[PDB]
Amino acid sequence: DVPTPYACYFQDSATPNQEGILELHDNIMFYLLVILGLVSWMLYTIVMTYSKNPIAYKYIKHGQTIEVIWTIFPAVILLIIAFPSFILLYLCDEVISPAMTIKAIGYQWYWKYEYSDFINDSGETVEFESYVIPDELLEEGQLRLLDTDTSMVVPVDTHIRFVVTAADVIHDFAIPSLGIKVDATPGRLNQVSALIQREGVFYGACSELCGTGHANMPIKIEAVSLPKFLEWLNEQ
């Protein structure tokens, strides 16, 4: 949900898509460690023994058995991890039966949120802009370059469709703990899906160099319960 000092791993997951991304990272690193164990060992035990060999084996120049075998072995490993990597690719691309859609538009160094399902009691479009709190205006305990003056409120256990675009230059809607990353290009609309399994606050940032204010454009998302979301929605 938030980065921590000296951390060397994924932030904790809140969606099934980020659960699956982490599962594929760990599955691949199982086989990259076998390969690094071999190569570093052969390298070490060749220098330590043949730096003291006075007669070189100059008549060994080829081998048919080992050269065929070491051409086939990397193909089997590469095929083993492509099976779950293809399944995850098509499981995240599907957006089937969502219950709400939210639009997010990137601007020169702020974000903008629009709700247009007209579920609120008066049937308008709910929309506001989100800005980073400046350093001079921070209250003690708030997080630098992360906390914003307004946030996006969503309910839990609900399938949500996100629609992302931009106004001036390219930006990027990204929240590490939700498994979301998608460019925001002036001219087209991309979509992504999410389903949050616990409550809390999840932080993100812009991820497409957008000029001087590329570091001052964070994303903050609050997930609450359903009766709590309807009360917030019906007021703001």
Binding site: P98, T101, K103, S116, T125, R161, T165, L189, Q191
Partner: protein, 75 residues
């Protein structure tokens, strides 16, 4: 739950969703140009282009239709 939004459409199954907005806006305005502004199932288009399409885009297309510059073929 009281939450509803437009669902999966087989004409636009990819991540790119640009034409889904534009076609619903175009269908809606030509539905009221011949079948009248009021039509029970002519609201199906109106909900979809409102749900998934920026308010600044609709603002631009409305102004173009006023000057006869909308590039969509609605008449």
């Amino acid at each position: 739950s009281p939450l509803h939004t437009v669902g999966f459409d087989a004409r636009f199954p990819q991540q790119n969703q640009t034409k889904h907005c534009w076609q619903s806006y175009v269908d809606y305005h030509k539905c009221v140009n011949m079948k009248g502004e009021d039509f029970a199932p002519c609201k199906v288009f109106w909900k979809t282009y409102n749900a998934l399409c920026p308010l600044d885009w609709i603002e631009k297309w409305d102004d173009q239709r006023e000057k006869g510059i909308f590039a969509g073929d609605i008449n």
